[PDB]
Amino acid sequence: KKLVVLDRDGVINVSPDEWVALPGSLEAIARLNHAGYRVVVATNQSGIGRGLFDMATLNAMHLKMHRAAAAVGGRIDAVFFCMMKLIAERFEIDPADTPVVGDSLRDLQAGAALGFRPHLVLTGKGKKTLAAGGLPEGTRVHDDLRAFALDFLSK
Amino acid sequence: KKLVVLDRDGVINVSPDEWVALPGSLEAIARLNHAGYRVVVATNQSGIGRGLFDMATLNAMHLKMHRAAAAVGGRIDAVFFCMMKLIAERFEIDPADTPVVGDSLRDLQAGAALGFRPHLVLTGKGKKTLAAGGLPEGTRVHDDLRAFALDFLSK
Amino acid sequence: KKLVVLDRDGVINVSPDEWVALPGSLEAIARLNHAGYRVVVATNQSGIGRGLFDMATLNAMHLKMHRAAAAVGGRIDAVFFCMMKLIAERFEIDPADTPVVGDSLRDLQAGAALGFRPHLVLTGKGKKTLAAGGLPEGTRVHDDLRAFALDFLSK
Amino acid sequence: KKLVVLDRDGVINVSPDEWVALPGSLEAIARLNHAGYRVVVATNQSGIGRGLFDMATLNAMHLKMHRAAAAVGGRIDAVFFCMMKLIAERFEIDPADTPVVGDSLRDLQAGAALGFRPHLVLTGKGKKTLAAGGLPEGTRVHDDLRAFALDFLSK
Amino acid sequence: KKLVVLDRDGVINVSPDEWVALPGSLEAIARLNHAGYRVVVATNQSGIGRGLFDMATLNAMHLKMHRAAAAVGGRIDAVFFCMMKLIAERFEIDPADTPVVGDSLRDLQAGAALGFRPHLVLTGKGKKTLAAGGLPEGTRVHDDLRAFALDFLSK
Amino acid sequence: KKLVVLDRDGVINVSPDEWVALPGSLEAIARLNHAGYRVVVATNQSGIGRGLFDMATLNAMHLKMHRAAAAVGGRIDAVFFCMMKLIAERFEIDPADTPVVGDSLRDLQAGAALGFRPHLVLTGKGKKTLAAGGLPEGTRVHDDLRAFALDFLSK
Numbered sequence: 049k050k051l052v053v054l055d056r057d058g059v060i061n062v063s064p065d066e067w068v069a070l071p072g073s074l075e076a077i078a079r080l081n082h083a084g085y086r087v088v089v090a091t092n093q094s095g096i097g098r099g100l101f102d103m104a105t106l107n108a109m110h111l112k113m114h115r116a117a118a119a120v121g122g123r124i125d126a127v128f129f130c131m132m133k134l135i136a137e138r139f140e141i142d143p144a145d146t147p148v149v150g151d152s153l154r155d156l157q158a159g160a161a162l163g164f165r166p167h168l169v170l171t172g173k174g175k176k177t178l179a180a181g182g183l184p185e186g187t188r189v190h191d192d193l194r195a196f197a198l199d200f201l202s203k
Numbered sequence: 204k205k206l207v208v209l210d211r212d213g214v215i216n217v218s219p220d221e222w223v224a225l226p227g228s229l230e231a232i233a234r235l236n237h238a239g240y241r242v243v244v245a246t247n248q249s250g251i252g253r254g255l256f257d258m259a260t261l262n263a264m265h266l267k268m269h270r271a272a273a274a275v276g277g278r279i280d281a282v283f284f285c286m287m288k289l290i291a292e293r294f295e296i297d298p299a300d301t302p303v304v305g306d307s308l309r310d311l312q313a314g315a316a317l318g319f320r321p322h323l324v325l326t327g328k329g330k331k332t333l334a335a336g337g338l339p340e341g342t343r344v345h346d347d348l349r350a351f352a353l354d355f356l357s358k
Numbered sequence: 359k360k361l362v363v364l365d366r367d368g369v370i371n372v373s374p375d376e377w378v379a380l381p382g383s384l385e386a387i388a389r390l391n392h393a394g395y396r397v398v399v400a401t402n403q404s405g406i407g408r409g410l411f412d413m414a415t416l417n418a419m420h421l422k423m424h425r426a427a428a429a430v431g432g433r434i435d436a437v438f439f440c441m442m443k444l445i446a447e448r449f450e451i452d453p454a455d456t457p458v459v460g461d462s463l464r465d466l467q468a469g470a471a472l473g474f475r476p477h478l479v480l481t482g483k484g485k486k487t488l489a490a491g492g493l494p495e496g497t498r499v500h501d502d503l504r505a506f507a508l509d510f511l512s513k
Numbered sequence: 514k515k516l517v518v519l520d521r522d523g524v525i526n527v528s529p530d531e532w533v534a535l536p537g538s539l540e541a542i543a544r545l546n547h548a549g550y551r552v553v554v555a556t557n558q559s560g561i562g563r564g565l566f567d568m569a570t571l572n573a574m575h576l577k578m579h580r581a582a583a584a585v586g587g588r589i590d591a592v593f594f595c596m597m598k599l600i601a602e603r604f605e606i607d608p609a610d611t612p613v614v615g616d617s618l619r620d621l622q623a624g625a626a627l628g629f630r631p632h633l634v635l636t637g638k639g640k641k642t643l644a645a646g647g648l649p650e651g652t653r654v655h656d657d658l659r660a661f662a663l664d665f666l667s668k
Numbered sequence: 669k670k671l672v673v674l675d676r677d678g679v680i681n682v683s684p685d686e687w688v689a690l691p692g693s694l695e696a697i698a699r700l701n702h703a704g705y706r707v708v709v710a711t712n713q714s715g716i717g718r719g720l721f722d723m724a725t726l727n728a729m730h731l732k733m734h735r736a737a738a739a740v741g742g743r744i745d746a747v748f749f750c751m752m753k754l755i756a757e758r759f760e761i762d763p764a765d766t767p768v769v770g771d772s773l774r775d776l777q778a779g780a781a782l783g784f785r786p787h788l789v790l791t792g793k794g795k796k797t798l799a800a801g802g803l804p805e806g807t808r809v810h811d812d813l814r815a816f817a818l819d820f821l822s823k
Numbered sequence: 824k825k826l827v828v829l830d831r832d833g834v835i836n837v838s839p840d841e842w843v844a845l846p847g848s849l850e851a852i853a854r855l856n857h858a859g860y861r862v863v864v865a866t867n868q869s870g871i872g873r874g875l876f877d878m879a880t881l882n883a884m885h886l887k888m889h890r891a892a893a894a895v896g897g898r899i900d901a902v903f904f905c906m907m908k909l910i911a912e913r914f915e916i917d918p919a920d921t922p923v924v925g926d927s928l929r930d931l932q933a934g935a936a937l938g939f940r941p942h943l944v945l946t947g948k949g950k951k952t953l954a955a956g957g958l959p960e961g962t963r964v965h966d967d968l969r970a971f972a973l974d975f976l977s978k
Contacts, residue, residue: 185651230381691850
C-alpha cells in the first residue's frame with residue numbers, strides 16, 4: 049500500500065466555505081489513483097483563521113474537499129494537524145519510499161529529515177520558496193501538482 | 204444574550220473513544236442553560252493526541268460531548284481552537300459580563316486581560332494551578348464546575 | 359455482586375424518546391458503580407406513554423438511557439416489566455442485602471415485603487407518596503437519588 | 514568565519530578520562546583549521562560514561578580533549594549537551610551552510626531538521642547507522658573524519 | 669559515613685552567571701555537615717539553560733556553588749547528571765539509610781523505587797508538585813531544606 | 824540617602840582566610856539590599872592581629888566578604904578603618920537617619936555621639952556588651968543581625 053503526502057494550501061486549492069481547487073490538482077490525484085497510490089492530504093490547522101471554528105465549518109470543508117476529489121473519480125485520505133512524524137506512523141509506510149509534496153520550506157525540510165522524498169511545487173508560495181533557497185539537497189521542483197503527478201508517474 | 208465560556212479539559216471532562224464527563228459538570232451546564240446562558244465549550248486542538256486525527260475521530264468527540272449535554276437536557280456551543288480574543292468576537296457579548304472557567308493559568312490570565320472575569324476550578328490541573336500562583340487579581344476559585352455554576356448563579 | 363434496584367420514572371428522569379435524566383441521578387449511578395454495585399434500572403411498562411409503543415421507540419429509549427449512563431462513565435442493567443418478586447431471582451442476590459429505590463408506595467411496599475431495604479426519593483411523586491403516608495416501617499427518605507447514593511455509601 | 518559541527522563520540526575518539534582520539538581525526542581538525550574553519554565538538558553529556566560525572570572527571574576529559582588537538586596544532590570549541598536547535602544560537606551561522614558530522618541517526622536527523630548538511634562517518638556506529646537506514650535525503654557518507662575533511666574541502 | 673542526596677534545583681538555589689542560594693539552605697548544609705553527614709548535591713544537567721554550555725560555564729557554576737557552602741562553613745559533594753541507580757553506587761551507602769530531597773516528582777519516585785527515603789521541599793516546583801500528587805507512599809514534606817535538616821536531625 | 828552601617832566582627836561572621844559568616848547575617852544583608860539599602864560593613868583593622876598583613880591577605884579578606892554576600896545575591900560596601908566621624912563623610916547621609924549596628928559598646932557609643940541610631944546584636948560579644956551595660960539611652964537590642972533587619976524594616 050503505497051502513499052503520497054500532500055499539503056492542502058497552495059497545493060490543491062488556492063471564505064473557508066467558498067473553497068476552490070486548482071484544476072490541474074484534481075487531475076493529479078486521480079491520475080495518481082489509477083497508478084495505485086494512496087493520497088494523504090495534510091491540512092495544517094494553524095491556517096484555519098487562528099483557531100475559531102465550530103463543527104459546521106469543519107464538515108463543510110472536508111465535504112467540499114471530499115466531493116472535489118470525487119468529481120473526477122479520485123480518492124484522498126484527509127488528515128488535519130495541530131505532522132510528518134505521525135503521517136508515516138498513522139499510515140502504513142516507509143518514509144524512504146514516500147514522497148512529500150508542498151509549497152513551503154517548513155514541511156519539505158521536516159519531511160526530508162525522516163527520509164521522505166521532498167517535492168516542491170511552484171504554485172502559491174512555491175515560487176517564493178524556491179528563490180529563497182535553503183531547501184533539502186535532493187528536492188525536485190515542479191510547476192504544479194499536475195506536473196508532479198505526471199513526472200512522479202514515470203519511473 | 205448572556206454567555207459563559209468553559210475550558211474543556213479538567214473542567215467538563217476528566218481514537219480517544221473512552222470519553223467521560225464529570226456528573227457535576229453536566230448538572231452545572233443544565234443549571235446554566237435554564238438561567239438563560241449560552242455555554243461555550245472551548246477545546247484546545249493542542250490536545251487531540253498531538254494532531255493525529257481524521258474527520259471520524261473529530262466527529263466522535265463532538266457527538267460524545269453533545270450527547271452528554273443532551274443527556275440531561277442541556278446545550279453547549281462547541282468551538283475548537285488551534286482564543287478568547289475571538290470568542291469575544293465570534294459571539295456578540297460584553298467580556299465584562301462574561302465568565303471564563305478553567306483549571307489552567309494560560310487561559311485565565313489571557314481572558315482577564317481583555318476584561319473577562321476569571322474563574323478557576325480545582326479539578327484536573329486546578330489544584331496545581333492554584334498553588335503555583337500568578338493568577339489575575341480578581342480570580343475566584345471553585346471546587347468544580349458544579350460549584351462554579353452554583354456560586355456564579357447568584358446574579 | 360452487590361445490587362441496587364432503581365425505578366426509571368421520577369427517580370432517574372423527569373414522548374418516550376424525548377427522554378431526559380436528572381444529572382444528580384447520573385452522579386448517583388456513577389458513584390454507586392465506583393463503589394462496586396451492579397445497578398438495575400427497573401422500568402414499569404405501564405408508563406411508556408400508558409402502554410402504547412412500537413419497538414423503535416423502545417430501542418431509542420434504551421439507547422437514550424444507556425448514553426446518559428455512559429456520559430459519566432456509568433453502567434446500568436435496564437430490565438422491563440409487565441416485579442421485585444422476580445428481580446432478586448433474575449439477578450443473584452439475597453433480597454435483604456439490596457436496597458430498592460423508588461417514588462411510589464406500590465413497589466417499595468412490594469420489595470420490603472420480600473426483605474428488600476426500601477428507599478424513597480422525594481423527587482417526582484416523592485413529596486406526594488410521603489404525604490399520603492402508609493410506607494413500610496423501616497423506610498429511609500432522601501431528597502433525591504444523589505442524596506440516596508451519598509447516604510447509602512456508608513455501610 | 515565558517516564553521517563545522519562534529520559529534521565527539523565515535524567520530525573523533527575511540528572511564529571518561531581514558532579518552533583517546535583517532536589519529537586521522539586529529540589531522541582532520543587541523544586541516545579544517547588551517548583552511549579557516551572553526552571546529553565545534555559536540556559532546557552528548559548522557560554519553561559521559563552514560564551520564565555519571567563530577568567536575569574532576571569532566572575537566573580532565575576536556576583537557577585530554579584539548580591536549581589531543583594541541584598535539585597537532587588544532588583548535589576546537591568543545592560544547593556539552595544534556596541540541597542542534599541551540600548550537601545555531603551560541604554560534605552565529607546559517608545551518609544551510611553548515612555540515613553536522615556524526616555516526617548516528619539522532620544527531621544527523623536533528624541537524625537536517627534545521628537545514629544542516631548531514632554527513633555520516635562510518636566509524637563507531639557509522640556502519641551500523643548506515644545499514645539501519647532511515648537517514649535524511651542529502652546525507653553524505655565518509656569512511657572516517659579524515660575522509661570527511663578531504664571530501665568537504667572540495668567545495 | 670552517612671549521606672544525604674540533595675537535588676540542587678528548587679532545593680538549594682533560587683544563566684549560571686547569576687547563580688544564588690537560599691540563605692537557609694546554606695545553614696542547612698553546614699548544620700548537616702557538622703552532624704557528620706556528607707552532603708551530595710545532584711545537578712540535573714538538562715537544566716543548564718536547557719543544556720547549552722561550555723566548560724567555563726560549568727566551572728563557574730561549580731565555583732559559585734562551592735564558594736556558597738564554604739561561606740558558611742559547609743562541604744558538599746557535587747555530582748552532575750545527564751540517576752539514583754548510580755549515586756548509591758558511585759557512593760558506598762545503603763539507600764535504605766539515605767534521604768533524597770527534591771521539590772519534584774521526577775526525583776523522589778526514582779529514589780523511592782530504590783529504597784531511598786523521599787523528602788519534598790515546598791520551594792521551587794515543590795508546592796505545585798505536592799498538589800499534583802502521584803508521589804511515593806512514605807514521602808515526608810518540609811517547607812524548605814532548612815526545615816528538612818531540623819526534622820531530619822532528630823533520631 | 825538611605826544607608827546602614829554594620830560592624831563586621833561578631834555581626835556578620837563567627838587566620839584572616841578562615842573567615843565564616845552567619846547564614847542569618849548573609850540573609851539579613853540581602854533582605855536589606857532588596858529593600859533598597861546600601862550596606863556598609865565596617866572592619867576595624869586594629870582587630871585583625873595588629874596589622875601584620877600585606878596586600879595579598881587583605882584582598883583575600885575582602886574577596887571572602889564579597890563572595891559570601893554574592894552567594895545570596897547581596898551587595899555590601901566594605902570599609903577598613905585605622906571612624907563614624909569619617910563614615911558620615913565618605914557617604915552623604917544624615918547620621919540621625921542612619922542606624923549603626925555592632926556587638927560592642929565602643930563603636931555604638933561612637934556612633935550615638937554623632938546622631939547615629941545605635942543597635943546591639945547579641946551575637947558574639949553582644950551578650951558581653953549587654954551585661955556590661957553603659958549603652959546610649961535609645962539603644963535597641965536584637966538576637967542577631969537576621970533579627971535586626973526585620974525590626975528595622977517597619978518604617
